[model samples]
Structure formats: structure tokens, C-alpha cells
Target: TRLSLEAMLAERAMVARQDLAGLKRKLAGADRVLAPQSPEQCGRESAQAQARSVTSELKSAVKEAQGLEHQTLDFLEQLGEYPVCGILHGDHPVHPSGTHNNNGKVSVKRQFAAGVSDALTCAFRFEDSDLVRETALKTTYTDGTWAGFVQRLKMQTTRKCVQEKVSRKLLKQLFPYDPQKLVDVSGELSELVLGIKTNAIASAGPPYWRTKRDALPDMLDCVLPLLYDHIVRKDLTTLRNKHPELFLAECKNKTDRYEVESLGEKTRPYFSHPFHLSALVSVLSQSFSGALKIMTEDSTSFNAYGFSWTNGGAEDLAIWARQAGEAGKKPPRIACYGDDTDIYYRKDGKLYRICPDFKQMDGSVDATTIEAVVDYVVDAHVKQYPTARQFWEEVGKLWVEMATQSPFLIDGTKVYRKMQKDGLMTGVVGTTLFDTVKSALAYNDWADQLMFGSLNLLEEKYAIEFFKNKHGLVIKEGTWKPALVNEDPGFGELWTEQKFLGLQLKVVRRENEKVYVPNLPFEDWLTMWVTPRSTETMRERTLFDRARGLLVTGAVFDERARGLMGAVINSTAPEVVCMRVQEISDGYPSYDWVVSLYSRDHPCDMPRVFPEAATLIASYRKQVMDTRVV
Candidate 1:
């Protein structure tokens, strides 16, 4: 009776009565136990406020579930009509997980396997023929055996189409077909996936999730069917319109707007992954709605120094804040590879730290906010989840020992060992550092952990040096550096006398004269600095014109020089190049600034050297790019 009632309710979800009273009860229960509400000033977790909030959240969840259902079915319908072409890629060629995966090569003909086929053809074939009876039979065709037989028969049919030399492209490019006007679109007709925008629509139905004789169905029955009734009265077009941020959860360090890469510009012709939109939004809706219900107990929400989700860098945050600021407008004369400016900013003498508001939060908090929840979680860690605190203690012990030994891995790497699996061989710094910070902050801020005064007790006891960034100061006292993925060592942080970004108006001559705030990510900084940007030197004549190359020259199998030399060496072909070369250096022991360029190779001879100064630059530049030099 319970199962039938839930199933009956789920079936008519779109137009059914959204009686989420029971669901509200379940959420309320979870809120109290696995709850953030416990942190709500003890007594203020009023029952009326709790019920009222959960009531509203349950209704929202059901409504979102319906929209998700509609999109999923709409996608299913599209497949029935146009069926997708094929699944592509495991071999992206240049960067196929880069040795992490040994994806052979993309063979246009071989990839299309003759289950893979049914994914493309099932709905369409079932639609074209009542292939249903053939697909849905009796004995071997029973619910269990039927699908495989249907696939076997249908696959043979598709092979017949292909065997006739009909192009695979035309046959498969059906459903994912888009509006046809967008570039970077379905024209490639690749199916939709995580996929770059293409007409290809893959099956989210299979991968989405499931149920049993037990829990899932019962649980889903409650949420899903209830959602059906909720969205029946609602009409939402894009997941963006209904649940704006739900789509962004999939967009890691990227915009949620689907665009295609058309050689140069972004384009989008078509896309459909209704199952994805619906299901993910379902999970997101439930999780966040649950959190919101908990936090609503005390108005816990987005606030202060660092919060939520990824951010691999400081430059990204600093620049983003500058660009968005009214007073800190873009600068002029900022040198290439110069110190990044507006390092820290101040509002009214109060330092304005760069805190990315959980994506789109400037004015309002989104669905989930556990500010108070986290305050309690910190204590939970010290008391309950001590494994985390223990992990940090281990990290400190490792580093304390590490400080005694060689810093770099003996094999020369920055990575640490995994919890068990092992990386480059050391402690797992990335996970430990970031993960510790997250537990400290209530599962927030994947990167950008703030370092401050008496930040947290565990860190203070274990390793406070790693989490101590001073306020409004730069370059001099306490600037965030490359201690643990903290890579902003600018003059503000790298040189001296740093002020917060909006601290004071930095003008030319105290007016508006902006100097170079060099912030080149390592690669860019290294690439340009090792060699001269201009091909021409004094005489100012173009040294190599185009053939002009750089050679630091001296070498006794020097390791550091190899990285610098590799940049130019990879570009040079002995059979190529007109023998023009510029030599550069810092006069270090075996070196000199050899700021000279030699050209005019009518005889086709190009190469180097410099006195007791020892062409270290000249010598090292000649070796194959064997190592990465800092």
C-alpha cells in the first residue's frame, strides 16, 4: 500500500497535489540530527520557524523535480525522433589526460563499436517500427532478456545501414541537432555529454541513478512524485531560469553558458541533456534545500574572508577583485611580468580582503549557508573528527622533518604522496592543506584558505606558519607566498612596502602613475624572462629577424640552463634558422649578461661563448631541455 501510494503519486507528479508535508517532516528530522540547526543559539531553533522553512523548501524541491522530469522526457522524446549519432573521445590527441591514460589514437572508422549502438538507436528504432514487440517479447525476450535481443537485432540492422556505405555521420546526427544558427555547435554533430557543445545527446537516463526493493525507490517516490505535482503548475525553460546556479555546479572554473569553440569564437547550436539537468538539479535541490532549512534557524549565511568552492590561485582572485572594483580601475604601464598590484585593498581604512562570494553572492546568500554550522563543526573536528586534526599534526611532523632534508623530491617534483596510493613521494600536501581548511570552514572554499591571527587552534598547535597572512601589508612583513599553493610573492608581497588594493589611491607621482604589477604565471614569466622579447638587440637591427634565437651558451651539463634553452631549442631546426643568436645572462660565477646578438649567417653558422665569464649562459643554452628550472 505504501509503495503503490508513492508510485501512484509519483506517476502524476506533474499535476498531482504537492503534499510535501511528510517530506518536510523527514527533512526536519535530518536537520536536527545531521543538522546545522543545533548551532542556532541553542534555544532559538523555534519549531514554527523550522516547520515553516522546511515546508517552503519541500515545495520548491518538488517543483524543481517536475521541471527536471520534463526536460529529461523532452530529451527522451528528442532521442525517439532524432536519436544521437555516437559517443566520441577518449583520445583527445594532444592532451588526453597526458599519459595518465593511454588512449591509443582516434580512428574515424574503428571507434564506432557495433550496447554502444543501442544507445544511439533504441528510441529511434522503437519509434520507426513497433519494434516494441520485437524489442519486448516473451521467453528470451522477457524484461531481462528482451533488451539484449533487441539490441542484437537492431545492431545488425545498423550494421546493414553502415555496410551499405551510408555515412555514419548522417545517420547518427539526429536528436542533438540544435537551433542551427550557433557556431561551436551541433554542426560537428557530436553528442552531448560533458561534451563540448554538439548535436550529440548521450544517455543520462542510464547513468543518472536507481532504486531497489528497499530504500531508493521509497525515498525517490517521496521526492520525485511530489515534485511532479509541484512543477505541473510551473513552466521553466532553461535550468538557468528556474535554478540559476544548479547548472553551474557542472561548470568547474568556467561559465555555465554552453558555447562552442569555433576556431576562434564561442558558438552553440544545440544541446540536450535533460536527464542531467533534471537529476542533478534534483540532488542539488534536495541537498541545498536541506541546508537552507537548517541554516534558516539562525540566519547563517555567506560571510567573511574565504568561502566555498574552487579557486587555484591568488592572481585570479586579486585581478578579479580589481577588475570589479569602482576605484581600482585597470592600470596603465603595468610592466610585463611585474608585481601584481592593488595587492590588498582597503575600504575605509578597513582592509578589504578578496572573498569570492560562493560564486554569485554579493548582495544575497544562495540556497545554502552554514556560517554558524561551521562554527560548531570546528569544535566537532577538535572533539569528534580528530582524524582531520591528526592529519594536520602528521603534516606538521612531516614538514618539520622535511625542513631538515632536501626540499625537492629526490627525483625533483612538487607533488606529495597520496593518503595511500602515493604521488611523487612525500606527504600529500594538496589534499591535507586544502582538506584541513575545508573541515575547518565547514566544507567550504576548495582553495584560498585564509591565514590570519590565531586563525584556528589546531593549526596554531600543528603549523601556524602555513596559515598566517597579515592584513593590509605586502612584500614586507607577512604576504601570502608559495608556502602551500600560495603563489603571490609580489613586491607588495615579494619586494617591499605593500598596501591593500584600495588602501590609498596609487596615482602617477601619487597621482595615477601605475608601474608594472608583474603577475605572470610561472610558465609565462619563465618563457619571456629567459630570452629577450624583441628579436633585435642594439644596432637595434633584428638579430634573427625571425630566425634570431637565444643561447645562454656555457654548459658542463648544467641542469637549470636546460629549461631556458629548451624554449628556443624546440623551435630551432639545425636544417632551419639563418644563424642569428642572442646571448643573455646575470653574470653568475660561470656566466655574464652577454647581452649581445650575433647575426648575418651568409656562411650559415650560428653559435656561442664569452671569456672567463665562462658562457654559463652560452653553455647551458645548448643542452636538450632536460629539466624545469625555477
Candidate 2:
């Protein structure tokens, strides 16, 4: 009976292996059949059909991989005590941990500050002290690390000439977005990335490490930039003075004396952190979003002129009041973020808040209506965001992810069993940093939507205020809304705003077009299509059906050639400039020989038409800023 059971398990494993191999071939074949080798190969008519087939086939293939892994495991479980697995368990990578051992010693992660080092190694005090120059020369041809830069490298096996190419090639990849915005960053990456100087001559950015070895460089990268600031700001004479033996290399201007090896002890905990190390640093850190907040009880700030987030709460309120008196302008109705005891308020167009700079309370400004709108968005996000459902959702997602992942003791590894901790649901999980951020982004979209859509709607309605969530990705998920609108507008132009870093847009929806109007405020690109054969003659021109767009109008040509940058129209005999605008959504924005021109020469802002050309400019007051007169 035991022999028979072993044979059965062996056969099942072989069959599962064969099945997966067959599916892999099928998936590869599908790619070859319908993949976009070029623009011409992917036709409009057949594209959808090919896409649908490819998607459906891939889905089935994925289902098979997951299913077979489970099915084979289950079959073995039903039969006997022994449990085992195949390729899935055979190979899997791990993240770097400070606690993880390296040859009986705690391993350290090492990576190069790739992009930053090239541009910034010679910055601030590092440049002054010549530390970068010394450490930089220790070029290890055989012992190349990820910063992979050998101050000067010579390829060991490759010929000398071939080594030259590697140097320049490595330099280009490290610089630039170093990285992108459109800037959702967390932790030290944000801090170091922010400080990197790109003042025309220099280019430095973010660095990434694949494993544990480069951890020390990443920490130095994080702290060194800040270290330079601390020295300048604090006017310090020497760094880590208390630990001079470890820190000081007995160095004068000799670059060889400076090395980062000593700084590693201080930076290690920050980068290669244990659970308690981070808690120690951040546990008592100021959790509040802001230093100022509005009072809920007395909406009117009389004796209660808004306070600062200082120790003297009631005294701070007094400081603000005295400043309002000192400043010429009335204290504006102000509600800066957070729950600071002091408050700002407005009634009947009069806005007021205590500037509260101790004895000199004179820096007050007109918060007025601006405070209210900002407060609306501000109040929505900060303070008391403990929604029952929202809190539970975060919890549910954590458990569901762990629970879903938790089901597998993963076929006899004690590893994932640690996650479960004896049959308990672990609160560790996540989804598209994309989806949550986007959903939370609902307000961002509406904020921007107000800017884009509100601008369109105001011809007659919504006594509207405009708001722009300049903080939107604009690509996708910008559609995510937040609950900001409490009172709907009856009849006014109200607004809000935001800014964004980067948003991934659907590839189909984005097109890189050539630009024509250099002076336009927004992005503009050119539209070009050519035909067969050259302009042979007047009769030959008839054979060419190529579409010809006026690449440059008369004024455009003048602007480029003579270099009079002003897009001025000579009023009476204005040249008819036919402008073309193309969009990714298909077709084009309505365009022609019309410009929305505003000039001192003409009392009105409309483009000077070729006297009575019978063209009209709409949305004059809003769109065309040529004059007060429509």
C-alpha cells in the first residue's frame, strides 16, 4: 500500500509539470501571433479581436498555474503524511533585513548612490573638504559594487578600449529622474531626493539598491545631504566631534584621508531598521498635521482671536489680537489647518485673525473667503477622520490579504507559519497604492474638475467658485472624488485648486504630436502627414493627394526668421493664420485663421481679422483678454 501511494504522487507531480510546460508554450505562441511588431501590424479593425483573444488566453493560462499548484498539493495531502512542492517553492527571493546573517555576521545592504554621486560628490562641504575625491579614487576593478563606479575602471577580461565605452554608458543611466514627478514619495527617498541640486550644471536624483549590501551607501546618501545643511545652518566646526577617533581621519586637504566607513554606525539603524528602531525615532514625533486650528465652540474669535501651536495657548490668542491692531489691514477670517485653539472668521466682507508674532503682531493678511475654501478641503482631510467604515475597510483589506495569503502554510515551510502566528488573521496587506490613493483622489478630481469643468460651465450658472486639485495625477484615478461640497452654489463663480506629480495615462489616450504654437500656455504639438513623390510641377501637384497643413502662418514665419517675438497683428491687413489643433481622442479642436489677441494698439482683445473677414470670437470676457470691452 505504501509503495502504491508513492507511485501515485510521483505520477501526479509529473503530469502537473507537463501541463505547465504546455501552457507556457501556448502563451509564448499567442505573443508571437498577435504582438505589435510595428504600427502597421496593429490595425484598427482587427486590433480588438486580437486583444480579446490574447487577454482571454492569458487569463486561462494564469488560472492553470495557480490551480495546478493547488490541485497537486491537495492530492498529496489527501493521501499521506509527507508533503512537498515543485518550482514555485524551489525558487523565491527575499528582502534585505538588518537581522539577517551573512557568514555568521549580521549582513549589511550595500548599494551606490548612483545618480547623486556623479553630480553631487563635490557639493558643499564634501567639495570643500575633498572627501569625495579621496574615497572616489579607490577604484576596485575586481571588486566593483553597484555604484559600479570605479573612480577609474579597467575591465579585467575585456580589452582596454572596450572598457572606455562602459564608463560613459554607466554615467547617463544614473542621472535624470535619478528620476519623475507628477511626487508621491515616502521616507528618506523624499528627503534626499528633495535636496539634490539640479542648478543647471548639476543633475542628481534618487538611487535604488537591489539587495542588502548597498544599505550603507543609501543611508549615507540620505544623511549626507542633510549633514551638509546641519553644518551650514548650525555653524558647526567639525562633524561628530564627540567621536573624533572614529570620525576624524587626521586629515588636512588630503582627499585620501576622508572615508565614509566611520559614519556607517550612525546611519545603519535608519536604513537597516529593526521594528523597535523606527518606533524609537517616530513614536513621540509630532503627530499633528499643523500648528494652528480653529475653535469649534465660539465661531467668532473675539476674546478668542486664533492661537498658535505654542505652549501659551490662551496667551498666543492674545498675541494674535494685538497684532491685528498693529497691522494696517484687518485680520482676515482665517482657518489654517489643524486644531490650534485660535480661530479666524469673517462676516459682512470683514475678515480678521490675530497675526500673533509675540509683541509684534503685524503680519496679518486677508484670509477672507480664501480661508473658508482652503478650510473646506483642509477640514475634510485632517482632524477626526476616523470614519467607522473607512477604518474597518483598512482592517478588512489587511486581514483579507493575509487570510488569502495565509491559507498556505505553503506546503511545509515554517516561514509563512510565522505570519499566521498560530491560526490568527494577520493585519498586513495592501492593494494598488494606485486604487486607495485614487479613490481618496475623488476630491482631487472634483477639485480639478471644478477648474476644468467649472470653467466650461460658468457662461451662465452655478454662482460658482472654482477649485483646482493641482495635486492630481490627471492620467487616471484623478476621477477619485472626496466629499468636499457641502453647500451647492446658487449663483456665483467659486473655485478650488491642486497640483500633481505624475499620473499613468492609458497609452491609447496619449499621443506625442509635433507642436506649432510656441507661445500657447498649454502643451501643443504639430500635425504632419506626407505623400509620395515631390512637388514636380503645377500639373504634377494634382497627382499628389497629400494633406498639407500650413506649417507656419505669415506671422509665425516672421517670428522665427526676423526674431520679433511679439505675436502682433497689424490690425487692418491682418494675415489669416490657419491654426490646426489635434487631440488624442480623435478629430481636432475647432481651429482656423483666428487668434485670441489682446494688444494696447486695439481697444478690444479679439484677434484683428482681415477687415470684415466674417469671423467671430466667442467667450470674450472669459477667454479673450484683449480689452474690458467685449
The parts of candidate 1 lying over 4 Å away from their true place are 1-458, 462-630
All candidates: TM-score: 0.19, 0.17
CA lDDT, every prediction? 0.21, 0.21
lDDT of 1 by residue, 430-538 (tens): 1122122222232111112222222231122222233222110112223332111112332223222333221211111112322122122222222222223222222
Model 2, runs deviating above 4 Å: 1-20, 26-275, 279-498, 504-630
| Candidate 2 residue 233 C-alpha distance from true site, Å | 36
1-630 per-residue lDDT for model 2 (tens digits):
456864875554344333434423323322111111111222333434443443344334323322321112221112111111111111321223323233422222333221111111111111222332222322111111211121111111011110011121221221111112211212233352333321222111111113323333433333334333433455222423321111110000101111123211111100111111111111111111122223322323221223222222322332343332111223322222111112222323332221211100000111111122222222332223323223223223223323222221212221121121111111111111112222222222332343443423212122111111232112222222211211111222111111111100010001232111212111110101101122222222221112111212212222121111121111001111211112101011111221211111222222222212112111012246666776
Error of 1 at 277 (Å): 3.8
For candidate 2, the TM-score is: 0.17
